């Protein structure tokens, strides 16, 4: 009995590859090389911010492009305004181990997660002017390694158990469950009208979602080892990927397969951050050897890098208005980059 | 504009109470040392996804954590454990003739010491259950010897210290494994990190403290002394 | 994607030999150590065999030292294993697997929570 259906699978796995393939006409190496290379990009550190005591893991821009949220391993969540270099708040957490935060859109809520399995929201507008816990989601069954906002009242999270969920806030129940990869889930982007989102694991693969139903749409593969980073294009018909064989790649929706790879031969270190410009020409990413590298996104070369850190690189953001990027790397500093 | 001004005096005085408050947690982070303990529940009594507990010896702060909430995949959160002093790790030994539980502790210990993130921290290592060797010894077979076919040509060590009372067997196959466990470790290592073992049986109320103590001791006492090239 | 497939089997009297085959498709085959994984009727899984990148540390366990050989060919792309004077506690669905990353001098690749990258196994009996 199972033969017929491993028998099966190969056939759908076939039929699969030969559609994939009747549609390669072209390359995106041919068809842009008629296009001017946009030079050198040379940026300069414009602020530091100091005051963390570990490991600095994750950092979430603010939609007003001003203000910051940064998550460190010694238990702490700092809110930091970044053109008078001020803080704002310090609040501390329960466990000291964090992997992620986020900061709601509205500019009232900031959330929080780790290694205890639980998912925590916390309240700023604080009319008695104290910043308390408002929520604890708990049900997951492994470590959370993502979270993202859709409003003041649902969130989508990411856990370890190969399982995605979407919640609501004022009962705390799972409304639905996305099942269906095989190893831990790392990251998660969300479409600009959230409607859809993607997943990326440790099994070299990646998975469209729709929220409102609840089931997969489109798998997508062509990496050789697990993906720790994922990002949408500007206008949601794309995104890219990096993983740990030093290598990104870039995937479009309507055709279902792959378009550019982007390596090089120097470079035999993972990556651990993508992000997109606001035009979507320029592509930075985050690497293993200390420094971020910034390439052209339709022609496939190096053109700048960003060299300023002592250790591992984390987290990497860029903002809305598209006017500064901030990293944030293991031995406690963020910097914001400009050019000129 | 007093508005601009009013708001760079109250930005100001909310940065120096949050500056105040901050300077006053270092010193108690500083002042604390985190441990890792890992196996391959009764343990954590002689001293959730996730279980912490803390305690105090000589006016000295210890934390410890315990991961049993997560899965068999490890390559991932292993990471964020990179700052910690020591890693304590516990074994359980047998020499009962189903599955090789030495062969899999061995190879975790393996991946543990030559991983690029762990290339800098020491392993306090606890060969627990003792009593199940001894209890096992005495069946006539030896799992070790289908298991390991090169326990035959061994011989005791010239610096045995045998507690009173135990069959030269049970000391023999004891030190055979404290020896397989050294050779792994006296392969890789340039002198920047070390391997405490230790013995137990299947009760550390008072003893686990006192030698985890020690053996912190030691490791930033050899830390200090290699930086002025004095070891 | 990557895709392993495994090749040599069936059933042998006892003191016979055999040879077990291991075909890789979907990654550089050179920079990856691989190794040999067996699962037993009724036990968990243990570790066979290893072998690195070149071919200058190869790593068995106790009980199949002086009768297993393993080797790699890296033009075909093929991993062997060579099984000779078998007893009758060796018969098991074989294994291969393939270390997650590259450039690299650890593994974490017993686990049975669906592993993802090895296949699906041969079956070795011996009887008489």
């Known amino acids: 009995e199972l033969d017929q259906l491993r028998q099966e699978a190969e056939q759908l796995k076939n039929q699969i590859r030969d559609a994939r393939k009747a549609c390669a006409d072209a390359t995106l190496s041919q068809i842009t090389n008629n296009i001017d290379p946009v030079g050198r990009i040379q940026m300069r550190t414009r602020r530091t911010l100091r005051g963390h005591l570990a490991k600095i893991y994750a950092m979430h821009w603010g939609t007003d492009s001003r203000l910051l949220v940064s998550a460190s391993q010694d238990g702490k969540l700092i809110i930091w305004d970044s053109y008078t270099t001020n803080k704002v708040h310090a609040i501390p957490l329960r466990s000291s181990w964090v992997m992620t935060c986020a900061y709601a859109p509205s500019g009232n809520y900031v959330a929080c997660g780790g290694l205890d399995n639980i998912c925590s929201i916390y309240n700023l507008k604080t009319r008695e002017g104290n910043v308390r816990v408002s929520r604890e989601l708990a049900g997951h069954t492994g470590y959370l390694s993502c979270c993202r906002f859709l409003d003041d009242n649902q969130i989508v999270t990411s856990s370890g158990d190969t399982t995605c969920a979407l919640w609501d806030i004022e009962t705390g129940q799972q409304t639905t469950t996305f099942t269906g990869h095989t190893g831990d889930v790392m990251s998660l982007s969300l479409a600009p009208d959230t409607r859809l989102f993607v997943s990326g694991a440790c099994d070299a693969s990646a998975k469209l979602w729709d929220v409102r139903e609840g089931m997969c749409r489109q798998t997508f593969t062509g990496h050789e080892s697990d993906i720790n980073a994922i990002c949408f294009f500007p206008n949601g018909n794309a995104f890219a990927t990096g993983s740990d064989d030093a290598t990104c790649r870039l995937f479009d929706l309507r055709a279902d397969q792959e378009l550019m790879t982007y390596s090089h031969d120097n470079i035999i270190c993972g990556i651990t951050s993508v992000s997109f410009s606001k035009s979507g020409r320029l592509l930075l990413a985050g690497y293993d050897d200390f420094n971020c590298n910034v390439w052209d996104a339709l022609k496939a070369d190096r053109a700048g890098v960003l060299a300023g850190h002592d250790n591992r690189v984390s987290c990497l953001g860029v903002t809305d208005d598209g006017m500064a990027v901030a990293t944030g790397s293991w031995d406690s500093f963020l910097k914001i980059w400009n050019g000129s | 504009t007093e508005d601009q001004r009013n708001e760079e005096k109250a930005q100001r005085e909310a940065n120096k109470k949050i500056e105040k408050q901050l300077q006053k947690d270092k010193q108690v982070y500083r002042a604390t040392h985190r441990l890792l303990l890992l196996g391959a529940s009764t343990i954590v009594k002689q001293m959730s996804g996730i279980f912490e507990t803390k305690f105090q010896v000589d006016k000295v702060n210890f934390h410890m954590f315990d991961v049993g909430g997560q899965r068999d995949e490890r390559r991932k959160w292993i990471q964020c454990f990179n700052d910690v002093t020591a890693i304590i790790f516990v074994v359980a030994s047998s020499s009962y003739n189903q599955t090789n539980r030495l062969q899999e502790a061995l190879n975790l210990f393996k991946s543990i010491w030559n991983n690029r993130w762990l290339r800098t921290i020491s392993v306090i290592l606890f060969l627990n259950k003792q009593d199940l060797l001894a209890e096992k010894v005495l069946a006539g077979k030896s799992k070790i010897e289908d298991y390991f076919p090169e326990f035959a040509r061994y011989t005791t060590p010239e610096d045995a210290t045998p507690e009173p009372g135990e069959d030269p067997r049970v000391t023999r196959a004891k030190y055979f494994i404290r020896d397989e466990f050294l050779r792994i470790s006296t392969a890789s290592g340039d002198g920047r990190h070390y391997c405490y073992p230790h013995f137990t049986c299947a009760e550390n109320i008072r003893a686990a403290a006192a030698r985890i103590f020690n053996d912190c001791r030691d490791i930033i006492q050899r830390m200090h002394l290699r930086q002025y090239e004095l070891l | 994607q990557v895709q392993l497939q495994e090749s040599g089997g069936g059933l042998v009297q006892p003191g016979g030999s055999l040879r077990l085959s291991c075909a890789a498709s979907?990654?550089?085959?050179?920079?990856?150590?691989m190794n040999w994984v067996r699962q037993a009727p009724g036990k968990g899984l243990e570790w066979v065999s290893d072998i690195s990148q070149s071919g200058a540390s190869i790593s068995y366990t106790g009980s199949v030292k002086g009768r297993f050989t393993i080797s790699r060919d890296n033009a075909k792309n093929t991993l062997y294993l060579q099984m000779n004077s078998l007893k009758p506690e060796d018969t098991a669905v074989y294994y291969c697997?393939?270390?997650?990353?590259?450039?690299?001098?650890?593994?974490?690749?017993?686990?049975?929570?669906?592993?993802?990258?090895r296949g699906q196994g041969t079956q070795v009996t011996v009887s008489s």
């Open positions: 979907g990654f550089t085959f050179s920079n990856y150590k």
């Open positions: 697997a393939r270390c997650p990353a590259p450039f690299t001098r650890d593994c974490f690749d017993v686990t049975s929570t669906t592993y993802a990258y």
